[PDB]
Design a protein around this ligand. Structure first.
Ligand code: A1ERZ
Length: 147
């Protein structure tokens, strides 16, 4: 009996159980703690060549592959989790969304407004929690639920 979307798994490298959320792609060692009309989220977007618009304020022509975008996302998540970098800092510097200029903040939103995988992950995140890689037609997202 775990919160929405969580399941038990076993580490291949360590053998210790961990928890994975199939809506948010979050993964963690600790057992998860546990819906509002609106949530507030920030995100860091890494676009790729198959993004709906392969262009951003960082790059007129985004040419990186989906796999390359995912590896960038993976490295940002690693540095956020290690404390080496802050989400807001990486979003401001590297997000391919115009919300980079607001440290990735998108403001508050309801169901029905965002692309569905983004929405589902946002609403399955607890306040303060961060997603793993979330895939949409825009690219690949790291989502931070702030409210
Ligand atoms: C103080 C902060 O937690 C932090 N985490 C780090 C990870 C790698 C290198 C430097 C780092 N500084």
């Amino acid at each position: 009996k775990l919160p929405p979307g969580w399941e038990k798994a076993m580490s291949r490298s360590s053998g210790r159980v961990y928890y994975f959320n199939h809506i948010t792609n979050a993964s963690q060692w600790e057992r998860p703690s546990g819906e509002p009309a609106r949530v507030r989220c920030s995100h860091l977007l890494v676009k790729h060549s198959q993004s709906r618009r392969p262009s951003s304020w960082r790059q007129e022509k985004i040419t990186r592959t989906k796999e390359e975008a995912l590896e960038l996302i993976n490295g940002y998540i690693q540095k956020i989790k290690s404390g080496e970098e802050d989400f807001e800092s990486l979003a401001s510097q590297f997000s391919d969304c115009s919300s980079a200029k607001a440290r990735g903040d998108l403001g508050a939103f309801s169901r029905g407004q965002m692309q569905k995988p983004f929405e589902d992950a946002s609403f399955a995140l607890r306040t303060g929690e961060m997603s793993g890689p979330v895939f949409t037609d825009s690219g690949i997202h790291i989502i931070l639920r702030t409210e």
